[PDB]
Design an enzyme around this catalytic site. Structure first.
Site, PDB file in Angstrom:
ATOM      1  N   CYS B  66       0.758  -1.199  -0.085  1.00 17.72           N
ATOM      2  CA  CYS B  66       0.023  -0.201  -0.197  1.00 17.72           C
ATOM      3  C   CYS B  66       1.085   1.358   0.041  1.00 17.72           C
ATOM      4  O   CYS B  66       1.460   1.845   0.490  1.00 17.72           O
ATOM      5  CB  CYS B  66      -1.068  -0.186   1.245  1.00 17.72           C
ATOM      6  N   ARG B  69      -0.025   4.484   2.853  1.00 15.13           N
ATOM      7  CA  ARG B  69      -0.289   4.303   4.471  1.00 15.13           C
ATOM      8  C   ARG B  69      -0.222   5.615   4.910  1.00 15.13           C
ATOM      9  O   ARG B  69      -0.182   5.150   6.815  1.00 15.13           O
ATOM     10  CB  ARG B  69       0.472   3.555   4.900  1.00 15.13           C
ATOM     11  N   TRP B 236      -9.908   5.036  -0.894  1.00 11.96           N
ATOM     12  CA  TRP B 236      -9.724   6.233  -2.469  1.00 11.96           C
ATOM     13  C   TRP B 236      -8.520   4.935  -3.614  1.00 11.96           C
ATOM     14  O   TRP B 236      -7.811   4.852  -2.655  1.00 11.96           O
ATOM     15  CB  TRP B 236      -9.699   7.529  -2.470  1.00 11.96           C
ATOM     16  N   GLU B 241      -4.582   2.834 -11.563  1.00 11.72           N
ATOM     17  CA  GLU B 241      -5.529   1.524 -10.653  1.00 11.72           C
ATOM     18  C   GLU B 241      -6.523   1.396 -12.206  1.00 11.72           C
ATOM     19  O   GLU B 241      -6.541  -0.011 -12.476  1.00 11.72           O
ATOM     20  CB  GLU B 241      -5.786   1.234  -9.411  1.00 11.72           C
TER      21      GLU B 241
HETATM   22  C1  HEM Z   1      -5.829   6.636   1.600  1.00  3.65           C
HETATM   23  C2  HEM Z   1      -5.741   5.887   0.135  1.00  3.65           C
HETATM   24  C3  HEM Z   1      -5.509   4.607  -0.376  1.00  3.65           C
HETATM   25  C4  HEM Z   1      -4.801   4.613  -1.207  1.00  3.65           C
HETATM   26  C5  HEM Z   1      -4.999   5.867  -2.121  1.00  3.65           C
HETATM   27  C6  HEM Z   1      -4.589   3.340  -1.509  1.00  3.65           C
HETATM   28  C7  HEM Z   1      -3.756   2.723  -2.603  1.00  3.65           C
HETATM   29  C8  HEM Z   1      -3.273   1.569  -2.595  1.00  3.65           C
HETATM   30  C9  HEM Z   1      -2.843   1.137  -4.321  1.00  3.65           C
HETATM   31  C10 HEM Z   1      -2.356   2.148  -5.338  1.00  3.65           C
HETATM   32  C11 HEM Z   1      -2.555  -0.441  -3.838  1.00  3.65           C
HETATM   33  C12 HEM Z   1      -2.835  -1.391  -5.083  1.00  3.65           C
HETATM   34  C13 HEM Z   1      -3.839  -1.690  -5.831  1.00  3.65           C
HETATM   35  C14 HEM Z   1      -3.478  -3.265  -6.684  1.00  3.65           C
HETATM   36  O1  HEM Z   1      -2.845  -2.511  -7.391  1.00  3.65           O
HETATM   37  O2  HEM Z   1      -4.488  -3.620  -6.836  1.00  3.65           O
HETATM   38  C15 HEM Z   1      -3.072  -0.884  -2.868  1.00  3.65           C
HETATM   39  C16 HEM Z   1      -3.289  -1.958  -1.888  1.00  3.65           C
HETATM   40  C17 HEM Z   1      -2.948  -2.487  -0.320  1.00  3.65           C
HETATM   41  N1  HEM Z   1      -4.071  -1.546   0.089  1.00  3.65           N
HETATM   42 FE1  HEM Z   1      -4.708   0.488   0.028  1.00  3.65          FE
HETATM   43  N2  HEM Z   1      -5.099   2.408  -0.542  1.00  3.65           N
HETATM   44  C18 HEM Z   1      -5.693   2.908   0.093  1.00  3.65           C
HETATM   45  C19 HEM Z   1      -6.381   2.649   1.644  1.00  3.65           C
HETATM   46  C20 HEM Z   1      -5.764   1.738   1.908  1.00  3.65           C
HETATM   47  C21 HEM Z   1      -6.736   1.104   3.123  1.00  3.65           C
HETATM   48  C22 HEM Z   1      -7.844   2.017   4.143  1.00  3.65           C
HETATM   49  C23 HEM Z   1      -6.330   0.252   3.820  1.00  3.65           C
HETATM   50  C24 HEM Z   1      -6.276  -0.787   4.500  1.00  3.65           C
HETATM   51  C25 HEM Z   1      -7.435  -0.820   6.512  1.00  3.65           C
HETATM   52  C26 HEM Z   1      -5.337  -0.279   2.697  1.00  3.65           C
HETATM   53  C27 HEM Z   1      -5.059  -1.840   2.490  1.00  3.65           C
HETATM   54  C28 HEM Z   1      -4.272  -2.018   1.372  1.00  3.65           C
HETATM   55  C29 HEM Z   1      -4.139  -3.308   1.237  1.00  3.65           C
HETATM   56  C30 HEM Z   1      -3.784  -4.808   2.013  1.00  3.65           C
HETATM   57  C31 HEM Z   1      -3.133  -3.020  -0.365  1.00  3.65           C
HETATM   58  C32 HEM Z   1      -3.291  -5.115  -1.255  1.00  3.65           C
HETATM   59  C33 HEM Z   1      -4.139  -5.446  -1.645  1.00  3.65           C
HETATM   60  C34 HEM Z   1      -3.764  -6.842  -2.094  1.00  3.65           C
HETATM   61  O3  HEM Z   1      -2.448  -7.231  -2.200  1.00  3.65           O
HETATM   62  O4  HEM Z   1      -4.259  -7.112  -3.590  1.00  3.65           O
HETATM   63  N3  HEM Z   1      -5.303   0.232   1.847  1.00  3.65           N
HETATM   64  N4  HEM Z   1      -3.405   0.307  -2.416  1.00  3.65           N
HETATM   65  N1  LIG Z   2      -6.847   2.712  -3.746  1.00  6.45           N
HETATM   66  C1  LIG Z   2      -6.750   1.100  -2.978  1.00  6.45           C
HETATM   67  N2  LIG Z   2      -7.383   0.838  -1.793  1.00  6.45           N
HETATM   68  O1  LIG Z   2      -8.060   2.017  -1.449  1.00  6.45           O
HETATM   69  N3  LIG Z   2      -6.747   0.454  -4.126  1.00  6.45           N
HETATM   70  C2  LIG Z   2      -7.594  -1.079  -4.024  1.00  6.45           C
HETATM   71  C3  LIG Z   2      -7.574  -2.157  -4.625  1.00  6.45           C
HETATM   72  C4  LIG Z   2      -7.817  -2.012  -5.684  1.00  6.45           C
HETATM   73  C5  LIG Z   2      -8.329  -2.416  -7.215  1.00  6.45           C
HETATM   74  N4  LIG Z   2      -6.898  -2.310  -7.617  1.00  6.45           N
HETATM   75  C6  LIG Z   2      -9.201  -1.666  -8.020  1.00  6.45           C
HETATM   76  O2  LIG Z   2      -8.483  -1.348  -9.373  1.00  6.45           O
HETATM   77  O3  LIG Z   2     -10.229  -1.985  -7.929  1.00  6.45           O
END
Ligand code: HEM
Ligand SMILES: N=C(NO)NCCC[C@H](N)C(=O)O
Ligand code: HEM
Ligand SMILES: Nc1nc2c(c(=O)[nH]1)N[C@@H](CNc1ccc(C(=O)N[C@@H](CCC(=O)O)C(=O)O)cc1)CN2
Ligand SMILES: Nc1nc2c(c(=O)[nH]1)N[C@@H](CNc1ccc(C(=O)N[C@@H](CCC(=O)O)C(=O)O)cc1)CN2
Ligand SMILES: N=C(NO)NCCC[C@H](N)C(=O)O
Lengths: 361, 361
Positions: B66, B69, B236, B241
């Site tokens: 993520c 964070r 968000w 993505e």
């Molecule tokens: C504040 C806004 C947030 C943004 C901009 C963000 C953005 C991202 C992005 C760009 C990825 C990669 C997505 C992909 O390639 O499929 C990701 C992955 C991830 N995020 Fe965040 N995130 C946010 C919030 C959160 C929140 C609220 C949580 C947890 C309480 C979280 C947990 C994770 C986890 C566990 C992954 C890995 C998902 C996977 O392995 O498929 N994210 N996030």
């Molecule tokens: N931006 C966040 N988490 O907030 N993204 C999570 C995984 C979403 C997934 N990559 C999609 O395009 O639907």
């Protein structure tokens, strides 16, 4: 003691693998006995012309960080193990630039210099690349990545004009000498490409240029326990190396804001993705410019497509594929290539090219 | 036997770390004794409102993949450990979409459902995301990544209109039931954004759209040995993505050639970098569209800049930073961000979010 033991073990592994690929499996027994007698008599062994030629080729095939590995078997190996003087090394390096450039139709080549005997080097090349720009630091002039080597060349008597594109001299040390020697590069030998755009006329105002051939000269080639510390190699450029890294990185030429200015877009908002649009136009310009001048270059999509055929051929030959994902993916549109969507085993297989400590710094 | 041993060891580690961060270091001794008595009496323990709230926050902070964070401490934790029926789970999931959407000003939220007691699940969510499009296969209709879940929903009695953007229903299984149940999503609850470009009028002919909130609903939250198999979360979207993956990948919507067609460029030559130019315009369009509709979104440059401040704050707090480089780098212009130019330790630190096996397939 332990050095003669490591040498024999890597030699047994190499000769068997090398001759199995060359269709000379019966010649292994007689050759390995001669090598055993040579290690006891001298403390090392000399490869045959066929051995190091294939060893340098196998070394390219095993280079994890290389996307251009499809052409591994077309490598032009120049044997210069006969060099004794600084003039001989200079002429060999001049020859390498000339034959590798080949008036623009770049030939993937490698020049093999005498290896290390008892851990000590015979020829030691200081240049990162045979053709590279100088860097100074007021403000930033030239290539920042070349700063320490430029300062080392200056401590030896060399002095550049202090332009953004000063060619560094060839700098190498011969066995017996405490310090290295330097030779300025003849301008006729170095092909440079001015960067222009196919649609935007104003791009020439940036006065950007780059050299035609990337000749890495500071890597160690290891073939069957024999360490070739001096073995310069070259392929041709992948456009992204110049347009997305050399001219784009903040720690390099940092031209993105200036590119954005000449293509008529604003640098106000991150949301307008001006950096991305600037990268696309600079990269389109690099590919057009090299092609217009008749200098070999490949775009990242074609290079990735070529690397896919390499993956297929390695499986067809029965060999395991090794790669470094972090380096194989292009720095522009990685998700548009197959490389991004799969994994690679980052295991080091010998023969290979390795990093070695910088004599300067 | 061994299950009660693993549970107590992870609980000791969590309570000590959690209370040290909350300024309640003296309350550790009395709480750990109560937990020991609870594990012997029932075979598990119940977290307090303060414990899981901070545990879900720490879990986000430890999410290696993520980039967002920086906002870890602003997570809105909704406690729904009181749910018993399928109606209760449906209302909780409907509430999550509503409160997280917040008329476009997206609130990073998580809904905590009852955890696993004796290894068996109380509530099991089948959806990858609460809001996701269906996929079918003639030719390809919809999202290919949703094919197996769509086929599983259809085997339960659900039937979609077979458009490219059919909303999948909420599908979950309650303890005691052999098969899951489904509920169609109310259109009023799901905000969708039509994709338009700021300069190119013809972009609307592509009839592209995407939903506003990514609510991952199939990951397991592990906090102090307690496995919350059902805990949907959301932040968000980062523009890339949608514009560089969901709508661009060959195995997803594969829109690059169609984007190239409406922006007036040729798809003839790899050297023209049409894919890269198409990616820039599609990504610029996604950011503009979400902003115009008042739906929260972040571009990759701003997100990377925010992640840099997170790296700084973690060092200032004395905690070790963990990350997955392969996922942290944006799929468009990665070398224009700091993430590309450094390394990250890919160690798994608990509490965290984990992948779990898909009940379908
Ligand atoms: C504040 C806004 C947030 C943004 C901009 C963000 C953005 C991202 C992005 C760009 C990825 C990669 C997505 C992909 O390639 O499929 C990701 C992955 C991830 N995020 Fe965040 N995130 C946010 C919030 C959160 C929140 C609220 C949580 C947890 C309480 C979280 C947990 C994770 C986890 C566990 C992954 C890995 C998902 C996977 O392995 O498929 N994210 N996030
Ligand atoms: N931006 C966040 N988490 O907030 N993204 C999570 C995984 C979403 C997934 N990559 C999609 O395009 O639907
Ligand atoms: C046919 C043309 C070739 C192309 C298109 C090609 C392309 C590339 C690219 C794009 C990289 C990464 C460059 C960087 O990020 O700095 C690379 C790395 C590398 N290549 Fe190739 N290459 C070619 C030929 C060669 C040859 C001829 C050899 C060896 C005999 C070779 C050996 C390597 C090695 C060892 C690396 C890693 C360099 C390092 O670690 O800094 N390449 N190549
Ligand atoms: N073409 C090309 N690709 C590159 C670079 C280059 O000049 N050329 N330079 C690199 C910039 N610096 C680094 C150096 C090391 C790591 C790195 O080590 N990353 C993983 C490694 C994972 C792994 O394989 O184990 C990690 O642990 O975080 C990442 C970026 C990245 N990719
Ligand atoms: N944002 C984001 N980034 C991504 C994906 C994503 O959906 N979202 N999907 C990924 C596509 N598939 C993979 C899966 C695994 C690996 C992988 O494992 N690579 C290294 C790992 C090195 C290491 O860290 O040890 C290797 O061994 O080759 C690479 C691409 C890549 N990056
Ligand atoms: N394309 C090849 N090898 O053929 N490249 C090697 C490294 C060159 C280095 N990236 C540069 O830009 O100078």
């Amino acid at each position: 003691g332990s050095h003669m033991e490591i040498l024999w073990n890597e030699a047994k592994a190499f000769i068997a693998e090398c001759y199995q690929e060359l269709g000379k499996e019966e010649e292994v027994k007689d050759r390995l006995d001669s090598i055993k007698s040579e290690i006891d008599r001298t403390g090392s062994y000399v490869h045959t012309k066929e051995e190091l030629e294939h060893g340098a080729k196998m070394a390219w095939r095993n280079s994890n960080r290389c996307i251009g590995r499809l052409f591994w078997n077309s490598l032009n190996v120049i044997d210069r193990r006969d060099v004794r003087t600084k003039e001989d090394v200079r002429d060999a390096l001049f020859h390498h630039i000339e034959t590798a450039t080949n008036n623009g139709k770049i030939r993937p080549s490698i020049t093999i210099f005498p290896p290390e005997e008892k851990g000590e080097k015979q020829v030691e090349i200081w240049n990162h690349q045979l053709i590279r720009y100088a860097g100074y630091e007021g403000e930033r002039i030239g290539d920042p990545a070349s700063r320490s080597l430029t300062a080392a060349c200056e401590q030896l008597g060399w002095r550049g004009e202090r332009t953004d594109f000063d060619l560094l001299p060839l700098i190498f040390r011969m066995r017996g000498d405490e310090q290295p020697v330097w030779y300025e590069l003849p301008r006729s030998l170095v092909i440079e490409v001015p960067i222009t755009h196919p649609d935007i006329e104003a791009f020439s105002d940036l006065e950007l240029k780059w050299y035609g051939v990337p000749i890495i000269s500071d890597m160690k080639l290891e073939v069957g326990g024999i360490h070739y510390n001096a073995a310069p190699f070259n392929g041709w450029y992948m456009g992204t190396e110049i347009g997305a890294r050399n001219l784009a990185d903040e720690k390099r030429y940092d031209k993105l804001k200036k590119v954005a200015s000449v293509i008529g877009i604003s640098t106000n908002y991150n949301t307008d993705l001006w950096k991305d649009q600037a990268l696309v136009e600079l990269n389109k310009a690099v590919l057009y410019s090299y092609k217009k001048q008749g200098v070999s270059i490949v775009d990242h999509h074609t290079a990735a497509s070529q690397f896919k055929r390499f993956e297929e051929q390695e499986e067809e030959a029965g060999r395991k594929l090794t790669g470094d994902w972090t380096w194989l993916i292009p720095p522009i549109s990685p998700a548009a290539t197959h490389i991004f969507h799969r994994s690679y085993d980052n295991s080091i297989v010998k023969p290979n090219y390795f990093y070695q400590d910088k004599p300067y710094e």
